[PDB]
Amino acid sequence: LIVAVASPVVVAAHSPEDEERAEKEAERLRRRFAEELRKKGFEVVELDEETDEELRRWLTKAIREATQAPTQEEFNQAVAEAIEKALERIEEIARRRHPDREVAAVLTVAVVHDGEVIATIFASPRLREALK
């Protein structure tokens, strides 16, 4: 199984220094997750910078739109749907790049809130299936 891991999407950083701090924390999380995948025998690949930046632009816009929701619950559902569609698109892109293999995807999302970085890893459906 080839797992394509996207560059982290850092959202709402107040300064370039905070964004770099969030990028490093999210990259460390992605690195630890990728090493865990390789222990399971999975090949881990990366996207090109243009695809990563298109993913960043789209998911940041989707998250910005979701802040208009009236409740946390509706916000959660909007962002979860956006993440699911972004994961599906990364799988499709990676499948076209590696058509001889089964492909899965991993998305990392980070935020800076009250001076701290919170980062989270999201696995595509095929990856979750493979990890069973």
Partner: peptide
């Protein structure tokens, strides 16, 4: 909607912690 200032970051932070807890995603924080 998010009318305040830290509303957007607080909403997203809550989601990330919610995803880790209620859906088994993997989270890290400083």
């Amino acid at each position: 909607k998010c009318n305040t200032a830290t509303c957007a970051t607080q909403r997203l932070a809550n989601f990330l912690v919610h995803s880790s807890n209620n859906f088994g995603a993997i989270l890290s924080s400083t």
